[PDB]
Amino acid sequence: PRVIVVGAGMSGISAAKRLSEAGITDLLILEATDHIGGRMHKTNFAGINVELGANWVEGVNGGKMNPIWPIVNSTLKLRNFRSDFDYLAQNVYKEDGGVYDEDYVQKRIELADSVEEMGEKLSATLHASGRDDMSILAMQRLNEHQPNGPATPVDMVVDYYKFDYEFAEPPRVTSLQNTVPLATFSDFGDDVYFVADQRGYEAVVYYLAGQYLKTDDKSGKIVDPRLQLNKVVREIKYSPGGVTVKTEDNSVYSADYVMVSASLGVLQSDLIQFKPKLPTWKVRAIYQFDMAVYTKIFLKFPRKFWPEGKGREFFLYASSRRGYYGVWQEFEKQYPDANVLLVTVTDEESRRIEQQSDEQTKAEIMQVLRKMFPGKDVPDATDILVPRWWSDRFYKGTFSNWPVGVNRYEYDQLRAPVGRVYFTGEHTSEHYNGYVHGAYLSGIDSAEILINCAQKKMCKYH
Amino acid sequence: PRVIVVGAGMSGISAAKRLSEAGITDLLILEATDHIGGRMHKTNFAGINVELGANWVEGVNGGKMNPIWPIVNSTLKLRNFRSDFDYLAQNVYKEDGGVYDEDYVQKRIELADSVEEMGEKLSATLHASGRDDMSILAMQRLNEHQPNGPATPVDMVVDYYKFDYEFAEPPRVTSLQNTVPLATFSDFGDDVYFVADQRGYEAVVYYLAGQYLKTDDKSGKIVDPRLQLNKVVREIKYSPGGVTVKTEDNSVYSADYVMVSASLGVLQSDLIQFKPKLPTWKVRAIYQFDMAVYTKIFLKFPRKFWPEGKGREFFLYASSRRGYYGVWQEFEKQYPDANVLLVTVTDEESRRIEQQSDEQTKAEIMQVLRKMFPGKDVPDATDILVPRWWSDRFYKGTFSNWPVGVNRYEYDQLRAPVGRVYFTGEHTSEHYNGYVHGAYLSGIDSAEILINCAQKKMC
Ligand SMILES: [C][N][C][C][C][N][C][C][C][N][C][C][C]([O])N1=C2C(=O)[N]C(=O)N=C2N([C][C]([O])[C]([O])[C]([O])[C]OP([O])(=O)OP([O])(=O)O[C][C]2O[C](N3[C]=NC4=C3N=[C]N=C4[N])[C]([O])[C]2[O])C2=[C]C([C])=C([C])[C]=C21
Ligand SMILES: [C][N][C][C][C][N][C][C][C][N][C][C][C]([O])N1=C2C(=O)[N]C(=O)N=C2N([C][C]([O])[C]([O])[C]([O])[C]OP([O])(=O)OP([O])(=O)O[C][C]2O[C](N3[C]=NC4=C3N=[C]N=C4[N])[C]([O])[C]2[O])C2=[C]C([C])=C([C])[C]=C21
Ligand SMILES: *[C@@H]1O[C@H](CO)[C@@H](O[C@@H]2O[C@H](CO)[C@@H](O)[C@H](O)[C@H]2NC(C)=O)[C@H](O)[C@H]1NC(C)=O
Ligand SMILES: *[C@@H]1O[C@H](CO)[C@@H](O[C@@H]2O[C@H](CO)[C@@H](O)[C@H](O)[C@H]2NC(C)=O)[C@H](O)[C@H]1NC(C)=O
């Protein structure tokens, strides 16, 4: 059987790998960009390679082994460090300079955590159809008995840190049932390890790809003609007998099946035309799920003016404006002596910021920093990097988030195949949507469904 | 039967009236503030009375008569004017100076309208159970084929004016099925009339109360001992046989039933303790619904510097920060010669602003106006009025809003009594939650439900 796989991110390379394993080697992987890895991709910033996209292996040291861990931590030995969030209470800055009293902050954190735990108990009891779901915010109101969730500067940045920094949209839009507790953590462990290796987290993808695609003996570059980069799929025609795939440069290919790995945001943007048009139930499923955006803004300074030391890696800015340049990370371990800082924003701020100049964003950040370190002579950043994933047509966002409103059956419709057209990608991960491991696993799962149809003549979906 | 009514806002006065009409006159209305009317309430600003709460009779000129209209337009003849939003396209200001090209804006408005219309068609097809409901944002994504809804400053402000200015929360939190289209307009008509009468929109409530509560023949003030102001209820105990209600000043009252009309926000806050505790099903429905906040910031200036004239009443500021001081109104017709402007914000901005000083808010607003009217010498406002409804423990918000996730059945649980504890108010209105007419009809309905149970034993 010949199979075309659209996209060479983690799930597409992962799917083709699984297919190869089942003996389906008549493969054609069409990648829009000039490289593989997709949302796992590094870039040079001021002399160091930093990750534009995924940066952590999330879910480690738990009851089951996150499949991404061994590859990262053993097979490849990518440099990495366990993130420690235990000292946040000593690191929350007031909108107007200096940090808040630690004990005061630890209490607010402890309360936030208790509400969330109460939320996990409620979640376990909800009807599996998702029909009784509610937003994380509704759960907060219920447990705090207030007509609003966190609303003071400190409780709001603690909330953002707890939720938006993980999911990229606010608790009020997010499905409780599908995120609290989060399977990634329940199954794989509460820890997270930040990859900071010149080779990039994407090395995991090149590794997997190398397990079945031919590579150059001296350079090790993949040279297998089954991988074709710079090939943007623009149309997929499918029928009872097969599928035809056309790229922007006018190439046309034929296969027995096609496996689509492009992000949810790509699917929501109509970059790829389906012929015939996808069924309405499929279309609605696509639009109802959320494609979030998480912007890692890197900054480079001529000198250091923030604290370093035990518990200093992560720090928060308690703005009275929710989500305004709130979550900071300093790199004493990852990029020692580089004088870089990373402030993370998402959702509304991400969209605003992608639409204006980096110079304007830098100036906004400089006022924040000077307000945070009033006693320091804070020098202007000499370099800034604003990743624009939402504006990039091959991504249209950073990762999916399960919103209140999408039920179990609707999520299955999002994953479901349409004729000979199969879907894969993090947004099709049953329990790990939004993650690298979810992409990896979704690739295997989608391939297996295809293998069943193709090899075992089992073509019915659910 | 003796019945205690908590709250003398529109629904409380409405329910007591309906009860009285059924002959249930042994009533005791306990109101927290020193006056009746609740969310319909005026105040003096700049030597003139403006509305801190509701200001429009919404849904007029349609297939059915909005019950409030005749009271306002005929019985009391409160002074009022139909709002015309037809010229918005000429009045959308750029973040940094002047208005946008009118044709460009009109087309953005049209796309927005068209998307909503398609949303209306879609909404009609969803199932009653609510199983296929989605947020308005999800509908916009689906109808426009994008991974996001309106996202440029202009599109965002148009979006904010069309939804948030009506519902006070963003489309992404809002239930499509239960707000688009909206019954209020579908039933009563598309127009809205702005009440600007010194007696206040609250006069409607006073008129209704005077139809059954005693009033002094000279003053006209209510003097019926059945109405007690400054009574903050803090505890309601109930048993299969009756109820006891305790107020903050330590008074204790007994009755056969209690009709609770305090806002959903008050109920989500714990100001009132129920004993025993309300059952889980009740509690979940309470916290799952939204109590929104809409803040009307009035400003007075030493002289006018904004345009007046045809289509000038309403204008938008397209900030790159969604919802930042975005919807403006000038009162050339309402308060001629007053030099007052009204800017409205909601939700996140409302909670942030209520938490800072008026001076700080004024200074933020002066920066926006100056950016809007770079050609003028804009004088600093002389006075500002920032209503703090969310902070007020007797309201904790301004009006409910229906969130994606809650279906009709769960919404109806809000209306459901618990034993002898009955509920009423805008958040219990079957199809008009969030409005003055919804509070009004809600009082009648809730009263009728208690009447059939209490008087005919049909519960
Ligand atoms: C408990 N406590 C704890 C605390 C913690 N906190 C922390 C923070 C975290 N945050 C969140 C997350 C983030 O960070 N990130 C990440 C990480 O880190 N980790 C993980 O895991 N993850 C993540 N992410 C996500 C990821 O990356 C994803 O999921 C993946 O990667 C995906 O994959 P897939 O599915 O495969 O997809 P992609 O890559 O996209 O691929 C696809 C492909 O395809 C292509 N195309 C398109 N279109 C087309 C094509 N071809 C052809 N044709 C056509 N038409 C493209 O190109 C590609 O290649 C993340 C992400 C991101 C972005 C960020 C920024 C971040 C993150
Ligand atoms: C087609 N086209 C369209 C266009 C249009 N646009 C325009 C805009 C609109 N916006 C939205 C709305 C607003 O404006 N507002 C209003 C108006 O205007 N109108 C209407 O209708 N409405 C409105 N609102 C709402 C109303 O006001 C409400 O709903 C009512 O009033 C409610 O009533 P109820 O339910 O009865 O409640 P209240 O009043 O609250 O009452 C209660 C009572 O109780 C008491 N308490 C409490 N707690 C307690 C007590 N007692 C004893 N104890 C205890 N514990 C209180 O005090 C009271 O009295 C509105 C509103 C507002 C606020 C605003 C600001 C606005 C509005
Ligand atoms: C990540 O990988 C390192 C690499 O081995 C692990 O550290 C080794 O663990 C074995 C187990 O006892 C030791 O014998 C080695 O001495 C350890 N190596 C070093 C350099 O200390 C480490 O435990 C791994 N971390 C996780 C979370 O799996
Ligand atoms: C609101 O009330 C005013 C008060 O009457 C209405 O205006 C009158 O309508 C009658 C009906 O024929 C006329 O004969 C009067 O001459 C009108 N009065 C004035 C002052 O014009 C008005 O139409 C009402 N509006 C609505 C929407 O009901």
Cα A8 to Cα A394: distance, rounded to the nearest angstrom: 12
Give me the DSSP letters along A27-83.
EEEE-SSSSS-TTS-EEEETTEEEESS--EEEEESSSS--THHHIIIIIS---EEE-
Q: A348: which chain B residues are within 8 Å (Cβ-Cβ)?
A: 322
Cα B325 to Cα B315: distance, rounded to the nearest angstrom: 11
Helices (H), B34-152: 68-70, 102-125, 136-144
User: Which residue's structure tokens are 């009263």?
Assistant: B447
Q: A141, A177, A319: which to substitute to probe chain B, counting the most B Cβ within 10 Å?
A: A141
Give residues with Cβ within 8 angstroms of B377, minimum separation 6.
B305
* Cα angle, residue A439 at apex, residues A433 and A443 outer, rounded to 5°: 120
Cα A438 to Cα A400: distance, rounded to the nearest angstrom: 11
Radius of gyration of chain A (CA): 23
Cα A145 to Cα A111: distance, rounded to the nearest angstrom: 13
Query: Which run of H or of E encompasses A97?
Result: none
Question: How far is the CA of A241 from the CAs of A3, A47, A251, A419, in angstroms?
Answer: 13, 52, 20, 10
Strands (E), A357-439: 383-385, 399-401, 421-423
CB atoms within 10 A of CB B114: 12
Phi/psi for A210 (5° steps) reads -65, -15
Q: Which of A111, A118, A123 is nearest to A175 (CA)?
A: A123
Cα A346 to Cα A165: distance, rounded to the nearest angstrom: 8
* Cα of B254 vs its chain's centroid, Å: 32
Radius of gyration of chain B (CA): 22
Question: How far is the CA of B249 from the CAs of A32, A212, A362, B397, in angstroms?
Answer: 72, 79, 56, 24
State whether B269 and A134 contact (CB < 8 Å). Answer: no
CB atoms within 10 A of CB A22: 15
Give me the DSSP letters along B122-135.
HHHHS-TT-TT--B
Cα A83 to Cα A315: distance, rounded to the nearest angstrom: 12
Phi/psi for B69 (5° steps) reads -55, -50
Q: Whose CA is nearest to atom 22 of ligand 2?
A: B435
Cα A427 to Cα A261: distance, rounded to the nearest angstrom: 9
Per the DSSP assignment, residues forming a β-bridge with B235 are B246, B273
State whether A284 and B390 contact (CB < 8 Å). Answer: no
Give me the DSSP letters along B267-292.
HHTTSSEEESPPPHHHHHHHHHSEEE
Give residues with Cβ within 8 angstroms of A336, minimum separation 6.
none
Dihedral sign, Cα of residue B133, residue B138, residue B143, residue B145: negative
- The CB of B106 under 6 Å from ligand 4? The reply is no
* Cα of B393 vs its chain's centroid, Å: 16
* Cα of A422 vs its chain's centroid, Å: 21
C-alpha A186 – ligand 1 centre gap (Å): 21
In Å, how far is B320's CA from the nearest CA of chain A? 7
- The CB of B436 under 6 Å from ligand 2? The reply is yes
- Ligand 4 binding pocket mutation candidate from B66, B73, B195 (most atoms within 8 A of CB): B73
Helix A136-144 to helix B280-288 angle (10° resolution) is 120
Q: Which of B201, B199, B158 is nearest to B69 (CA)?
A: B201
State whether B268 and A146 contact (CB < 8 Å). Answer: yes
Cα B145 to Cα A315: distance, rounded to the nearest angstrom: 38
B162 DSSP assignment: I
CA atoms lying within 13 Å on the CB side of residue B13: 29
How many residues appear in chain B?
459
Helix, strand, coil abundance in chain A, percent, nearest 5: 35, 20, 45
The catalytic position among B58, B169, B202, B330 is: B58
In Å, how far is A169's CA from the nearest CA of chain B? 11
Cα A270 to Cα A285: distance, rounded to the nearest angstrom: 14
A125 burial class (0-12, 13-18, 19+ CB within 10 angstroms)? exposed
* Cα of B175 vs its chain's centroid, Å: 17
Instruction: Give binding residues of B for FAD as ranges.
Output: 10-11, 31, 39, 55-56, 233, 395, 426, 435-436
Q: Which of B418, B417, B419, B443 is nearest to B429 (CA)?
A: B443
Instruction: Give the atom of ligand 2 at the shortest distance from the alpha carbon of B167.
Output: 11
CA atoms lying within 13 Å on the CB side of residue A233: 29
Cα A34 to Cα A8: distance, rounded to the nearest angstrom: 10
Strand A294-300 relative to strand B80-82, pairing:
unpaired
Query: Which run of H or of E encompasses B87?
Result: none
- The CB of A8 under 6 Å from ligand 1? The reply is yes
Q: Which two tokens stand for residue B279?
A: 């059952």
Cα B418 to Cα B239: distance, rounded to the nearest angstrom: 10
- The CB of B9 under 6 Å from ligand 2? The reply is yes
B410 catalytic residue (yes or no): no
* Cα of A258 vs its chain's centroid, Å: 24
Q: Which domains does chain A have, with CATH numbers?
A: 1-83+183-288+408-462 (3.50.50.60), 84-182+289-407 (3.90.660.10)
Cα B432 to Cα B184: distance, rounded to the nearest angstrom: 6
Cα A98 to Cα A121: distance, rounded to the nearest angstrom: 37
Q: How many helices (H) and strands (E) does chain B have?
A: 14, 22
A418 DSSP assignment: B
Residue B417 preceded by cis peptide, ω within 30: no
Q: Which two tokens stand for residue A257?
A: 């099946």
A390, A351 contact by CB (below 8 A):
yes
Cα B240 to Cα B297: distance, rounded to the nearest angstrom: 47
Instruction: Give binding residues of A for FAD as ranges.
Output: 10-11, 31, 39, 55-56, 233, 395, 426, 435-436
Query: Which run of H or of E encompasses A238?
Result: strand A233-238
CB atoms within 10 A of CB B449: 21
Question: How far is the CA of A3 from the CAs of A31, A442, B365, in angstroms?
Answer: 14, 17, 60
Q: A284: which chain B residues are within 8 Å (Cβ-Cβ)?
A: 142
Cα A189 to Cα A66: distance, rounded to the nearest angstrom: 8
> What is the 3-state secondary structure of B327-374?
EEEECCCCCCCCCEEEEEEEHHHHHHHHCCCHHHHHHHHHHHHHHHCC
Cα A130 to Cα A119: distance, rounded to the nearest angstrom: 15
Per the DSSP assignment, residues forming a β-bridge with B299 are B341, B384
Long-range Cβ contact pairs of A154-157 (< 8 A, separation 24 or more):
A154/A92, A154/A100, A154/A104, A154/A105, A154/A108, A154/A318, A155/A108, A155/A112, A156/A318, A156/A322, A157/A92, A157/A316, A157/A317, A157/A318, A157/A319, A157/A322, A157/A326, A157/A327
In the sheet that B383-385 helps form, which strands lie side by side, from edge to edge?
B92-94, B314-318, B327-330, B340-346, B294-300, B383-385
Q: Which two tokens stand for residue B386?
A: 């920032």
CB atoms within 10 A of CB A182: 20
Q: After which residues is the backbone of chain A broken at C–N > 2.5 Å?
A: none
Give residues with Cβ within 8 angstroms of A327, minimum separation 6.
A157, A160, A161, A165, A314, A316, A317, A343, A344
CB atoms within 10 A of CB B96: 10
Give me the DSSP letters along B237-278.
EE-SS-EEEEETTS-EEEESEEEE-S-HHHHHTTSSEEESPP
Dihedral sign, Cα of residue B400, residue B405, residue B408, residue B412: negative
Q: Which of B441, B448, B449, B439 is nearest to B416 (CA)?
A: B449
Q: Is B269 on the interface with A (CB under 8 A)?
A: yes
C-alpha B209 – ligand 1 centre gap (Å): 62
A262, A424 contact by CB (below 8 A):
no
* Cα of A322 vs its chain's centroid, Å: 22
Dihedral sign, Cα of residue A128, residue A129, residue A131, residue A135: positive
Dihedral sign, Cα of residue A306, residue A307, residue A313, residue A317: negative
CA atoms lying within 13 Å on the CB side of residue B114: 8
State whether B134 and A283 contact (CB < 8 Å). Answer: no
Q: What amino acid occupies position A162?
A: K
State whether A268 and B146 contact (CB < 8 Å). Answer: yes
Q: Which two tokens stand for residue A409?
A: 């059956």
3-state secondary structure of B436: helix
Final resolution, Å: 2.0
Q: Which two tokens stand for residue B50?
A: 């403006």
A247 DSSP assignment: E
Q: Which two tokens stand for residue A131?
A: 């029909």
B102 burial class (0-12, 13-18, 19+ CB within 10 angstroms)? middle
* Cα of B240 vs its chain's centroid, Å: 34
Instruction: Give binding residues of B for substrate as ranges.
Output: 58, 166, 434
Q: What amino acid occupies position B337?
A: D
- The CB of A202 under 6 Å from ligand 1? The reply is no
How many residues appear in chain A?
462
Q: Which two tokens stand for residue A322?
A: 């929710």
A89 DSSP assignment: G
Q: A414: which chain B residues are within 8 Å (Cβ-Cβ)?
A: none
Cα A55 to Cα B228: distance, rounded to the nearest angstrom: 63
Residues 282-311 of A with CB under 8 A from B: 283-284, 287-288, 291
The catalytic position among A51, A58, A313, A349 is: A58
State whether B287 and A138 contact (CB < 8 Å). Answer: yes
How would you label B70-95 residue by residue, b for 16+ Cβ within 10 Å and e otherwise?
A: ebbbeebebebeebeeebbbbbbbeb
Question: How far is the CA of B259 from the CAs of A454, B37, B267, B272, in angstroms?
Answer: 66, 16, 13, 13
